Scaffold this active site. Structure first.
Site, PDB file in Angstrom:
ATOM      1  N   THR A 121      55.153  54.805  -7.753  1.00  0.00           N
ATOM      2  CA  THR A 121      55.926  54.126  -6.721  1.00  0.00           C
ATOM      3  C   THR A 121      55.614  54.630  -5.321  1.00  0.00           C
ATOM      4  O   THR A 121      56.063  54.056  -4.333  1.00  0.00           O
ATOM      5  CB  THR A 121      57.423  54.284  -6.968  1.00  0.00           C
ATOM      6  OG1 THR A 121      57.755  55.677  -7.018  1.00  0.00           O
ATOM      7  CG2 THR A 121      57.814  53.624  -8.281  1.00  0.00           C
TER       8      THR A 121
ATOM      9  N   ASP B 214      33.957  43.363  34.401  1.00  0.00           N
ATOM     10  CA  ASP B 214      32.586  43.003  34.054  1.00  0.00           C
ATOM     11  C   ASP B 214      31.577  43.862  34.797  1.00  0.00           C
ATOM     12  O   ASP B 214      30.562  44.251  34.229  1.00  0.00           O
ATOM     13  CB  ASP B 214      32.300  41.509  34.364  1.00  0.00           C
ATOM     14  CG  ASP B 214      32.317  41.190  35.879  1.00  0.00           C
ATOM     15  OD1 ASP B 214      31.373  40.559  36.414  1.00  0.00           O
ATOM     16  OD2 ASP B 214      33.293  41.565  36.548  1.00  0.00           O
TER      17      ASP B 214
ATOM     18  N   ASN C 149      56.374  59.262  -9.043  1.00  0.00           N
ATOM     19  CA  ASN C 149      55.551  59.531  -7.885  1.00  0.00           C
ATOM     20  C   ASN C 149      54.298  58.672  -8.002  1.00  0.00           C
ATOM     21  O   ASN C 149      54.121  57.691  -7.280  1.00  0.00           O
ATOM     22  CB  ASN C 149      55.173  61.007  -7.872  1.00  0.00           C
ATOM     23  CG  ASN C 149      54.180  61.335  -6.798  1.00  0.00           C
ATOM     24  OD1 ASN C 149      54.456  61.142  -5.618  1.00  0.00           O
ATOM     25  ND2 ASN C 149      53.008  61.835  -7.197  1.00  0.00           N
TER      26      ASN C 149
ATOM     27  N   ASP D  92      34.599  47.817  38.578  1.00  0.00           N
ATOM     28  CA  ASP D  92      35.714  47.766  37.640  1.00  0.00           C
ATOM     29  C   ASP D  92      35.789  49.088  36.872  1.00  0.00           C
ATOM     30  O   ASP D  92      36.843  49.451  36.342  1.00  0.00           O
ATOM     31  CB  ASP D  92      35.547  46.611  36.638  1.00  0.00           C
ATOM     32  CG  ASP D  92      35.741  45.238  37.273  1.00  0.00           C
ATOM     33  OD1 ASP D  92      36.835  44.979  37.818  1.00  0.00           O
ATOM     34  OD2 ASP D  92      34.801  44.413  37.217  1.00  0.00           O
TER      35      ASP D  92
ATOM     36  N   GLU E  64      24.148  35.563  44.125  1.00  0.00           N
ATOM     37  CA  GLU E  64      22.863  35.500  44.816  1.00  0.00           C
ATOM     38  C   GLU E  64      21.854  34.559  44.173  1.00  0.00           C
ATOM     39  O   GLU E  64      21.201  33.768  44.849  1.00  0.00           O
ATOM     40  CB  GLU E  64      22.257  36.890  44.900  1.00  0.00           C
ATOM     41  CG  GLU E  64      22.777  37.735  46.044  1.00  0.00           C
ATOM     42  CD  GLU E  64      22.013  39.028  46.170  1.00  0.00           C
ATOM     43  OE1 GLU E  64      22.175  39.715  47.195  1.00  0.00           O
ATOM     44  OE2 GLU E  64      21.252  39.355  45.232  1.00  0.00           O
TER      45      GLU E  64
ATOM     46  N   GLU F  99      62.734  50.690  -7.242  1.00  0.00           N
ATOM     47  CA  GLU F  99      61.830  51.016  -6.151  1.00  0.00           C
ATOM     48  C   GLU F  99      60.847  49.889  -5.868  1.00  0.00           C
ATOM     49  O   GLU F  99      60.612  49.546  -4.714  1.00  0.00           O
ATOM     50  CB  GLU F  99      61.086  52.317  -6.447  1.00  0.00           C
ATOM     51  CG  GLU F  99      61.962  53.540  -6.255  1.00  0.00           C
ATOM     52  CD  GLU F  99      61.183  54.823  -6.333  1.00  0.00           C
ATOM     53  OE1 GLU F  99      61.735  55.889  -5.989  1.00  0.00           O
ATOM     54  OE2 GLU F  99      60.011  54.766  -6.741  1.00  0.00           O
TER      55      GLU F  99
ATOM     56  N   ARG G 165      40.422  40.173  47.967  1.00  0.00           N
ATOM     57  CA  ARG G 165      39.683  40.935  48.963  1.00  0.00           C
ATOM     58  C   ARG G 165      40.099  42.389  48.872  1.00  0.00           C
ATOM     59  O   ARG G 165      40.287  43.060  49.882  1.00  0.00           O
ATOM     60  CB  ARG G 165      39.992  40.396  50.362  1.00  0.00           C
ATOM     61  CG  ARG G 165      39.477  38.982  50.643  1.00  0.00           C
ATOM     62  CD  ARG G 165      37.974  38.899  50.506  1.00  0.00           C
ATOM     63  NE  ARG G 165      37.469  37.571  50.816  1.00  0.00           N
ATOM     64  CZ  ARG G 165      36.246  37.154  50.519  1.00  0.00           C
ATOM     65  NH1 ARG G 165      35.407  37.965  49.895  1.00  0.00           N
ATOM     66  NH2 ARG G 165      35.854  35.934  50.855  1.00  0.00           N
TER      67      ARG G 165
ATOM     68  N   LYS H 201      41.641  48.543  42.854  1.00  0.00           N
ATOM     69  CA  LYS H 201      41.861  48.207  41.461  1.00  0.00           C
ATOM     70  C   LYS H 201      42.447  49.403  40.712  1.00  0.00           C
ATOM     71  O   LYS H 201      43.373  49.255  39.916  1.00  0.00           O
ATOM     72  CB  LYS H 201      40.546  47.751  40.818  1.00  0.00           C
ATOM     73  CG  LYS H 201      40.068  46.405  41.339  1.00  0.00           C
ATOM     74  CD  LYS H 201      38.807  45.909  40.655  1.00  0.00           C
ATOM     75  CE  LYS H 201      38.454  44.503  41.136  1.00  0.00           C
ATOM     76  NZ  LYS H 201      37.157  44.023  40.595  1.00  0.00           N
TER      77      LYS H 201
ATOM     78  N   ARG I 122      33.753  29.116  45.692  1.00  0.00           N
ATOM     79  CA  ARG I 122      33.546  30.486  46.153  1.00  0.00           C
ATOM     80  C   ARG I 122      32.616  30.250  47.332  1.00  0.00           C
ATOM     81  O   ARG I 122      31.681  29.477  47.210  1.00  0.00           O
ATOM     82  CB  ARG I 122      32.835  31.305  45.085  1.00  0.00           C
ATOM     83  CG  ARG I 122      32.169  32.544  45.619  1.00  0.00           C
ATOM     84  CD  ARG I 122      31.637  33.415  44.510  1.00  0.00           C
ATOM     85  NE  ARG I 122      32.366  34.675  44.425  1.00  0.00           N
ATOM     86  CZ  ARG I 122      31.800  35.875  44.515  1.00  0.00           C
ATOM     87  NH1 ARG I 122      30.488  35.986  44.696  1.00  0.00           N
ATOM     88  NH2 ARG I 122      32.545  36.966  44.432  1.00  0.00           N
TER      89      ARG I 122
ATOM     90  N   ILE J 243      56.935  63.954  -0.899  1.00  0.00           N
ATOM     91  CA  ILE J 243      55.946  64.023   0.170  1.00  0.00           C
ATOM     92  C   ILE J 243      55.057  62.784   0.131  1.00  0.00           C
ATOM     93  O   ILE J 243      54.237  62.630  -0.771  1.00  0.00           O
ATOM     94  CB  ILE J 243      55.045  65.266   0.003  1.00  0.00           C
ATOM     95  CG1 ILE J 243      55.876  66.537   0.161  1.00  0.00           C
ATOM     96  CG2 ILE J 243      53.902  65.230   1.006  1.00  0.00           C
ATOM     97  CD1 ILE J 243      55.151  67.782  -0.290  1.00  0.00           C
TER      98      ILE J 243
ATOM     99  N   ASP K 201      39.744  41.401  36.404  1.00  0.00           N
ATOM    100  CA  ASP K 201      38.802  41.063  37.460  1.00  0.00           C
ATOM    101  C   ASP K 201      38.693  39.546  37.389  1.00  0.00           C
ATOM    102  O   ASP K 201      39.022  38.958  36.356  1.00  0.00           O
ATOM    103  CB  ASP K 201      37.450  41.724  37.150  1.00  0.00           C
ATOM    104  CG  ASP K 201      36.294  41.121  37.933  1.00  0.00           C
ATOM    105  OD1 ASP K 201      35.447  40.418  37.341  1.00  0.00           O
ATOM    106  OD2 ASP K 201      36.229  41.351  39.150  1.00  0.00           O
TER     107      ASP K 201
HETATM  108  N1  LIG Z   1      25.325  40.266  47.013  1.00  0.00           N
HETATM  109  C1  LIG Z   1      26.120  39.912  48.020  1.00  0.00           C
HETATM  110  N2  LIG Z   1      25.616  39.719  49.248  1.00  0.00           N
HETATM  111  C2  LIG Z   1      26.396  39.359  50.252  1.00  0.00           C
HETATM  112  N3  LIG Z   1      27.697  39.178  50.092  1.00  0.00           N
HETATM  113  C3  LIG Z   1      28.269  39.356  48.894  1.00  0.00           C
HETATM  114  C4  LIG Z   1      27.482  39.731  47.813  1.00  0.00           C
HETATM  115  N4  LIG Z   1      28.281  39.833  46.756  1.00  0.00           N
HETATM  116  C5  LIG Z   1      29.519  39.540  47.150  1.00  0.00           C
HETATM  117  N5  LIG Z   1      29.518  39.255  48.450  1.00  0.00           N
HETATM  118  C6  LIG Z   1      30.704  38.934  49.277  1.00  0.00           C
HETATM  119  O1  LIG Z   1      31.529  40.115  49.295  1.00  0.00           O
HETATM  120  C7  LIG Z   1      32.787  39.772  48.692  1.00  0.00           C
HETATM  121  C8  LIG Z   1      33.453  40.956  47.990  1.00  0.00           C
HETATM  122  O2  LIG Z   1      32.663  41.403  46.885  1.00  0.00           O
HETATM  123  P1  LIG Z   1      33.368  42.173  45.661  1.00  0.00           P
HETATM  124  O3  LIG Z   1      32.345  42.637  44.698  1.00  0.00           O
HETATM  125  O4  LIG Z   1      34.323  43.161  46.213  1.00  0.00           O
HETATM  126  O5  LIG Z   1      34.230  41.017  44.946  1.00  0.00           O
HETATM  127  P2  LIG Z   1      33.506  39.724  44.319  1.00  0.00           P
HETATM  128  O6  LIG Z   1      34.374  38.544  44.518  1.00  0.00           O
HETATM  129  O7  LIG Z   1      32.116  39.655  44.824  1.00  0.00           O
HETATM  130  C9  LIG Z   1      33.396  40.103  42.553  1.00  0.00           C
HETATM  131  P3  LIG Z   1      35.017  40.106  41.746  1.00  0.00           P
HETATM  132  O8  LIG Z   1      35.697  38.674  42.016  1.00  0.00           O
HETATM  133  O9  LIG Z   1      34.688  40.106  40.172  1.00  0.00           O
HETATM  134  O10 LIG Z   1      35.869  41.245  42.154  1.00  0.00           O
HETATM  135  C10 LIG Z   1      32.431  38.668  47.699  1.00  0.00           C
HETATM  136  O11 LIG Z   1      33.613  37.938  47.358  1.00  0.00           O
HETATM  137  C11 LIG Z   1      31.556  37.837  48.633  1.00  0.00           C
HETATM  138  O12 LIG Z   1      32.366  37.214  49.633  1.00  0.00           O
HETATM  139 CA   LIG Z   2      55.369  61.339  -3.078  1.00  0.00          CA
HETATM  140 CA   LIG Z   3      59.022  56.757  -4.683  1.00  0.00          CA
HETATM  141 MG   LIG Z   4      33.402  40.653  38.375  1.00  0.00          MG
END
Ligand SMILES: Nc1ncnc2c1ncn2[C@@H]1O[C@H](COP(=O)(O)OP(=O)(O)CP(=O)(O)O)[C@@H](O)[C@H]1O
Ligand SMILES: [Ca+2]
Ligand SMILES: [Ca+2]
Ligand SMILES: [Mg+2]
Ligand SMILES: [K+]
Length: 987
Positions: A798, A702, A795, A706, A442, A902, A677, A683, A559, A307, A351
């Site tokens: 080994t 992140d 035992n 997600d 932003e 062994e 998009r 996802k 972007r 065992i 992501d």
């Molecule tokens: N705070 C905000 N205000 C206005 N527009 C925004 C915004 N945040 C994102 N967007 C626009 O909306 C789109 C889609 O957002 P979403 O969160 O789905 O993907 P994302 O690219 O912003 C993050 P990820 O690439 O990690 O998925 C962004 O790509 C951007 O074009």
């Molecule tokens: Ca044993």
């Molecule tokens: Ca053994």
């Molecule tokens: Mg992200």
């Protein structure tokens, strides 16, 4: 820490005497802090009881050994004669191996728990507060917030401490409290109080508990209590601690353990009955009982020898070892089953923004309209310098430094960025760096507004702190933001409703929108040229979109976002705000203003990690809400695609993916490595499809969008600098955002397996021939090969230390260059069974051939010239010898050859199919030492006189030993051969 939530807004602000808009003065903070203490917890005490850990004594097996030790203790007690010295030893020899593995487990277990704690003691939690020393939110270490000062929370944020909700800035506020209460779902909240004083947590819909995450929305409130008063600090240890049960690999092995508990159970009971003829016999006190009894021991002992009492203890050790090594790489394992699972991960979904990229954004290119004349559309494209969030940089046109305020089109462009933004900058004096407060994207626009300074606000001489938001505040002090229509993935844009201050343009109310170019551009009927407005036309719309695409697929794979403004918004009244779905409608009939292009650098370790994943047989998929162009571009530059490789059907967008019929979607998932998009649940769906092909998949995120995927996936991997929402759903957190670790994780996860597979091979092939030894000697005319204690010995020598050491085995030659293990692949293939059998065969018939050898061919005792005198029944059967059949000389030779062969067999388990020549004993310096520790322990029992009688007679140094190695060593060559069959052949 005022003892209540019962009272409304005013009473708590008044209770602590603070303005919701300014917050505590540096003095108050000094006081409240001395009075109330640092908002933290003694929690910094977690360290399992010295002994609480010594629970290697609970697995299925091992208990067996403990049981066998009992019956050995009762027998040894009663049993009378010139024994006791051999009667009472047996039990200790049975639990000494347990004690041995016990330690190794406890030790590598302490170090693990110990390193996991240091991973957390590194990077203190932070919070966003409003203090009077700064006009804009500021981030401070959470341990430094005190009851009373104003605090701000938002989507993804983890509630820093118990808080009376003073005001909800977003048009709704949900939160995840499950961790505290249980209610698994975004729970709603509101400003007003609830009469019930000592009510139940689950009701206070006007509070936020330290430890809970914000699901959606933004809110500002006053810390009702911190420290231990927290409805999460008192209910600290009380939690029964839901430490999940064994992992998938342990459940798989613990089951394979009892699979043997059965087989062995038979072998023993069987080996017992196939005696009897020796029960009533002479040698056994002459009685049938003493005869039957002696044989229950041959069985019992045989069991305890077969065992693998070191199996459960090994999986444990190996696991904690993985954890400890991940911690070392700054990776937090939040779930025991992670590493083992990544090991067999067929696909890794990830992501983009933040995960695959640094999320360190900055506006570098931006444009508005210059002039229009027919199909010709002239754009005023500017460039911006400064890659950090620092408000230091200049706006350039034709590479010459311009006065941004000179163009009315850029004034508005700046106005829109400042007002349609829930973020800000905060100067961190400790590092002298401008940090963001809110979403990266932003914030980038905030720094931009600072750089533009369209109203030439004098800022040459302002504090590094006061400068951070200077220019923005000026645009804010000129426009009253009535309400904001939160951002939503469905329409991919955000809007903000503003009224003029003291009414300049009369009742000229506007709506400032910013969002994904395509959607915003589509919802524009007008284009702005300076102060003028004109209807959108085909040539203009195409020009606007062409430059964006140019910017999105270039060297800088920018972007982008479109900035627009609804000149005449609907009447404030006809707008409903508790249904996002309606907002896109409000954001229509717009006027295009401009576009901004952001730099968002891919993480340096990504391309490399992506490559290694290919070799490992790991498929890598990019899922993002960003533009597909920007996506495919970024994918090429990261390694998902080739620089000019056609991707016609390996890259889809949200829309496209949905237009595909169920049947094709699944296929698109096995074929595509880029989805852009993507809508909300996309996802998750994408992870479901890959799982509907029986593939171990993993999600890497992140943010909050997600979370779903992260949970659906078999393995969720979150970013250290990401949200707490994603980290929660996740099973692992890259504390330092090093994508490479994932690969390092998958590797360790594989090694951990191979090791278990090797530990098993050895532990098995050995033990087979171990019994093969009895069912070939006790049933072939030969005399007893060994006895009770003699079994409990091999035992304890080994099946102990030298095997457990196999856990500290290094990673095979090309372990991370072989495809992932099928989720269905059997634990032990058929050939593996042959491999165990062959070795089990020899070892089993070179342990019996060594007993006979002595009796015959050997230059000792009798010689029974090749025949063993046929039988043993002689009591003129040749009568040329006494009773050399009950001699120890022959058994010592057996016991010692079994042992030696062994350990020799152990060296065959450093790697599954690898020539010792490529990977020598010193690859696992631990196995070596272990072997010696067992080997030396053998000699002591063999020659230090007090011990020998308790076992057997000293095999003549030299010759006898030389004979041992001459028949043991072949096992090393026998398997070395088996390996050559699979390595250079079979495949
Ligand atoms: N705070 C905000 N205000 C206005 N527009 C925004 C915004 N945040 C994102 N967007 C626009 O909306 C789109 C889609 O957002 P979403 O969160 O789905 O993907 P994302 O690219 O912003 C993050 P990820 O690439 O990690 O998925 C962004 O790509 C951007 O074009
Ligand atoms: Ca044993
Ligand atoms: Ca053994
Ligand atoms: Mg992200
Ligand atoms: K998960």
């Amino acid at each position: 820490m005022e003892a209540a939530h019962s009272k409304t807004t005013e009473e708590c602000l008044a209770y602590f005497g603070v303005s919701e808009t300014t917050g505590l003065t540096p003095d108050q903070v000094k006081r409240h802090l001395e009075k109330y203490g640092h908002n933290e917890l003694p929690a910094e005490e977690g360290k399992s009881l010295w002994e609480l850990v010594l629970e290697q004594f609970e697995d299925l097996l091992v208990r067996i050994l403990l049981l066998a030790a009992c019956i050995s203790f009762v027998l040894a007690w009663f049993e009378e004669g010139e024994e006791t010295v051999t009667a009472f030893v047996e039990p200790f020899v049975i639990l000494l191996i347990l004690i041995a593995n016990a330690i190794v487990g406890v030790w590598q277990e302490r170090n693990a728990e110990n390193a996991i704690e240091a991973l957390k003691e590194y990077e203190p939690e932070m919070g966003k507060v409003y203090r009077a020393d700064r006009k804009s939110v500021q981030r401070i270490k959470a341990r430094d917030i005190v009851p009373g000062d104003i605090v701000e929370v938002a989507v993804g944020d983890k509630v820093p401490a118990d808080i009376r909700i003073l005001t909800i800035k977003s048009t709704t506020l949900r939160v995840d409290q499950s961790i505290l209460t249980g209610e698994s779902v975004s729970v709603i909240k509101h400003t007003e109080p609830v009469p019930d004083p000592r009510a139940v947590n689950q009701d206070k819909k006007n509070m936020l508990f330290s430890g809970t995450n914000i699901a959606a929305g933004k809110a500002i409130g006053i810390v009702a209590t911190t420290g231990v008063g927290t409805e999460i600090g008192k209910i600290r240890d009380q939690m029964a601690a839901t430490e999940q049960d064994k992992t998938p690999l342990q459940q798989k092995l613990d089951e394979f353990g009892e699979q043997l508990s059965k087989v062995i159970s038979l072998i023993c009971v069987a080996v017992w009955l196939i005696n009897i003829g020796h029960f009533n016999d002479p040698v056994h006190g002459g009685s049938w009982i003493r005869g039957a009894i002696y044989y229950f021991k041959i069985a019992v002992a045989l069991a305890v020898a077969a065992i693998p009492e070191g199996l459960p203890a090994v999986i444990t050790t190996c696991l904690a070892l993985g954890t400890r090594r991940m911690a070392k790489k700054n990776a937090i394992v939040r779930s025991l089953p992670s590493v083992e699972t990544l090991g067999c991960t067929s696909v890794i979904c990830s992501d983009k923004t933040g995960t695959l990229t640094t999320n360190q954004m900055s506006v570098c290119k931006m444009f508005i309209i210059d002039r229009i004349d027919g199909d010709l559309c002239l754009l005023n494209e500017f460039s911006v310098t400064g890659s950090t969030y620092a408000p230091e940089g200049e706006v350039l046109k034709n590479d010459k430094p311009v006065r941004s305020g000179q163009y009315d089109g850029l004034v508005e462009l700046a106005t829109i960025c400042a007002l349609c933004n829930d973020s800000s900058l905060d100067f961190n004096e400790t590092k002298g760096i401008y940090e963001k407060v809110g979403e990266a994207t932003e914030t980038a626009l905030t720094t931009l507004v600072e750089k533009m300074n369209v109203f030439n606000t004098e800022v040459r001489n302002l504090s590094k702190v006061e400068r951070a938001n200077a220019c923005n505040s000026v645009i804010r002090q000129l426009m009253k933001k009535e309400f904001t229509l939160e951002f939503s993935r469905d329409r991919k844009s955000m809007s903000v409703y503003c009224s003029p201050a003291k009414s300049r343009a009369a009742v000229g109310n506007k709506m400032f929108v910013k969002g994904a170019p395509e959607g915003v551009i589509d919802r524009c009927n007008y284009v702005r040229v300076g102060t003028t407005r004109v209807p959108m036309t085909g040539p203009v719309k195409e020009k606007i979109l062409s430059v964006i695409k140019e910017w999105g697929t270039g060297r800088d794979t920018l972007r982008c976002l479109a900035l627009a403004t609804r000149d005449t918004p609907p009447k404030r009244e006809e707008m409903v705000l508790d249904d996002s779905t309606k907002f896109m409608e409000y954001e229509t009939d717009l006027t295009f203003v401009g576009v901004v292009g952001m730099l968002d650098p891919p993480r340096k370790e990504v391309m490399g990690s992506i490559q290694l994943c290919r070799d490992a047989g790991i498929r890598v998929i990019m899922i993002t809400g960003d533009n597909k162009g920007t996506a495919i571009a970024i994918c090429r530059r990261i390694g998902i695609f080739g620089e000019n490789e056609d991707v016609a059907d390996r890259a889809y967008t949200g829309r496209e993916f949905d237009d595909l019929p169920l049947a094709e979607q699944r296929e698109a998932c096995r074929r595509a490595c880029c989805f852009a998009r993507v809508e909300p649940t996309h996802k998750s769906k994408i992870v479901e499809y890959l799982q509907s092909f029986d593939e171990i998949t993993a999600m890497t995120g992140d943010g909050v969008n997600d979370a779903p995927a992260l949970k659906k996936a078999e393995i969720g991997i979150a970013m250290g600098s990401g949200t707490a929402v994603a980290k929660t759903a996740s099973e692992m957190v890259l504390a330092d955002d090093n994508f490479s670790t994932i690969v390092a994780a998958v590797e360790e996860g594989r090694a951990i397996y191979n090791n278990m597979k090797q530990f098993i091979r050895y532990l098995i092939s050995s033990n087979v021939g171990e019994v093969v030894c009895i069912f070939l000697t006790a049933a072939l005319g030969l005399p007893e090969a060994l006895i009770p204690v003699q079994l409990l010995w091999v035992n304890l020598v080994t099946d102990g230390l030298p095997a457990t050491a196999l856990g500290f085995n290094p990673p095979d030659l090309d372990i991370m260059d072989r495809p992932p293990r099928t989720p269905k692949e059997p634990l032990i293939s058929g050939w593996l069974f042959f491999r165990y059998m062959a070795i089990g065969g020899y070892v089993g018939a070179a342990t019996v051939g060594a007993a006979a050898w002595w009796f015959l061919y050997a230059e000792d005792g009798p010689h029974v010239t090749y025949s063993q005198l046929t039988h043993f029944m002689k009591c003129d059967f040749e009568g040329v010898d006494c009773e050399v059949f009950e001699a120890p000389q022959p058994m010592t030779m057996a016991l010692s050859v079994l042992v030696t062969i062994e350990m020799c067999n152990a060296l065959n388990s450093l790697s599954e199919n690898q020539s010792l020549v490529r990977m020598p004993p010193w690859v696992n310096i631990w196995l070596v030492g272990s072997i010696g520790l067992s080997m030396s322990l053998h000699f002591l029992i063999l020659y230090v006189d007090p011990l020998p009688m308790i076992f057997k007679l000293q095999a003549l140094d030299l010759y006898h030993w030389l004979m041992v190695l001459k028949i043991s060593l072949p096992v090393i060559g026998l398997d070395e051969i088996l390996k050559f069959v699979a390595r250079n052949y079979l495949e």
